Amino acid sequence: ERPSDLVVNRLVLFVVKGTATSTHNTVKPLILLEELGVPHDIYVVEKVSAPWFSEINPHKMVPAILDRSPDGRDTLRAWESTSTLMYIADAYDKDGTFGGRNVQERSEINNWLTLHTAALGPTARYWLYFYKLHPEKLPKTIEKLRSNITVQYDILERRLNEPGQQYLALKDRPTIADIATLPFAMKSTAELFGLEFEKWPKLQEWSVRMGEREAVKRAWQRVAGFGHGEKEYGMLE
Amino acid sequence: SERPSDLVVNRLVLFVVKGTATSTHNTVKPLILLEELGVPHDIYVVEKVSAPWFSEINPHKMVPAILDRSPDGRDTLRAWESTSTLMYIADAYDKDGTFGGRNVQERSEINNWLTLHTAALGPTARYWLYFYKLHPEKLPKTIEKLRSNITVQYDILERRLNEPGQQYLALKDRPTIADIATLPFAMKSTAELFGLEFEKWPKLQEWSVRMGEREAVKRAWQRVAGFGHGEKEYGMLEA
Numbered sequence A: 001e002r003p004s005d006l007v008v009n010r011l012v013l014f015v016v017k018g019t020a021t022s023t024h025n026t027v028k029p030l031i032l033l034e035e036l037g038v039p040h041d042i043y044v045v046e047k048v049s050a051p052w053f054s055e056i057n058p059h060k061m062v063p064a065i066l067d068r069s070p071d072g073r074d075t076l077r078a079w080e081s082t083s084t085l086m087y088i089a090d091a092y093d094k095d096g097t098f099g100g101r102n103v104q105e106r107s108e109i110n111n112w113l114t115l116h117t118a119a120l121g122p123t124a125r126y127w128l129y130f131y132k133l134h135p136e137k138l139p140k141t142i143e144k145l146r147s148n149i150t151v152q153y154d155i156l157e158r159r160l161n162e163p164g165q166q167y168l169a170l171k172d173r174p175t176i177a178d179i180a181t182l183p184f185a186m187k188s189t190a191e192l193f194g195l196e197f198e199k200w201p202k203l204q205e206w207s208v209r210m211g212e213r214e215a216v217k218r219a220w221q222r223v224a225g226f227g228h229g230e231k232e233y234g235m236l237e
Numbered sequence B: 001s002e003r004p005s006d007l008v009v010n011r012l013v014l015f016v017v018k019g020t021a022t023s024t025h026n027t028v029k030p031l032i033l034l035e036e037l038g039v040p041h042d043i044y045v046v047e048k049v050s051a052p053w054f055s056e057i058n059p060h061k062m063v064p065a066i067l068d069r070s071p072d073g074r075d076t077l078r079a080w081e082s083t084s085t086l087m088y089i090a091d092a093y094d095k096d097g098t099f100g101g102r103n104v105q106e107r108s109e110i111n112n113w114l115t116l117h118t119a120a121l122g123p124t125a126r127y128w129l130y131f132y133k134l135h136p137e138k139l140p141k142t143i144e145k146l147r148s149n150i151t152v153q154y155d156i157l158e159r160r161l162n163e164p165g166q167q168y169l170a171l172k173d174r175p176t177i178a179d180i181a182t183l184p185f186a187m188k189s190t191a192e193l194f195g196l197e198f199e200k201w202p203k204l205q206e207w208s209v210r211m212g213e214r215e216a217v218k219r220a221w222q223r224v225a226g227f228g229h230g231e232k233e234y235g236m237l238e239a
Helices: A027-036 A081-092 A103-133 A139-159 A176-184 A187-192 A201-211 A214-225 B028-037 B082-093 B104-134 B140-161 B177-185 B188-193 B202-212 B215-226
Strands: A011-015 A040-044 A064-068 A075-079 B012-016 B041-045 B065-069 B076-080
Touching (some): A027 A081, A064 A081, A075 A081, A081 B104, A103 A176, A103 B076, A139 A201, A176 A201, B028 B215, B065 B082, B082 B104, B177 B202, B202 B215
Parallel strands (some): B012 B041
Antiparallel strands (some): A064 A075, B065 B076
């Protein structure tokens, strides 16, 4: 049931129409693609409920990836934003600049990547659901989720207060752990949650340091635009 | 913070708590992989996860956690979050990628199904359990929505295991860290806790039995239940 314009000649990143609250997961793989200069296409999904899309991601959410296998004879897929970061690092980051160069680096990268994937990420996702999408309003649930966000900010703040710890996983450079965390740990997102981001100064300084990277600027610029160009849905450009 | 005198890192040390019906569903995950690969390891039964010395290992103040020697033996490494403990054991000890994946194609699907548990199943189960038992007030509308999300997640796993020759979640041929991560939240006992009839997902049930029949899985479940009930209640157990 695949749309006619869906072809996989290179990495295809699946996104939706760009809004303030539709881009915080899709921007993650886009940042890493921009950091590594990976050739890729953008596919704007009209309906994530469409049967053809569930064959790619059974969880029926963006981001998702279709790409050629290393030998180029088969197609493979990545879904869940953390999984898209793990795939891009595996396939395209051969020097381990963002994925980690050894067991030691990867131990810490996986600690802070998994902490985001298991705690802040899902908590932020449930907060957004109950705050906007759920038919009924449940303030007690929304407040508890907001409370849990501040606990995760406290953990990140502690880490970034350790001597010479410029980034979450490694002291020297940002990794897929930092890319996964940034969209749910920046001033704009903090303000959406109704939090004063200045209460976590080292986390705020970290979010600014990440935001000054050219690949991060390019990612935020592009993700906002998807679906608002001459072509509303389907394969862009 | 000073570590307890009996905490030394001569090999992989897995941090657990005293074995109970409600304390083992995460700690069993790394233990299953350690048993599958025959990795040499010690067991440390943590009395108080609130202890400052333990927060220096895992800032999230939960088990499982790991301390281990670096490959070269110069440094001490750490792994925390159960999914991260599986990643670390696979990286350090699974040289043939028997559970970690042998190529980019295998690892793509392993990381999909692993992360589905880490990001969706695990947090949904944790929030259900929190609102059902731990939260001072009962919020049945929240609990019912989380229970609903569990059935959708069971539907996804069932769909995958209905695909021709798909015997395991990630790979057709063998179980991986994806299967190990998922098993405790997709088995009959857990389904009954959620108030669900597990027979509604027959291929998922068949998969849970297939995983449960593995010798390493049997050994893991026995050992996690026993920790802290031997000759030593807390601290480094004597293998």
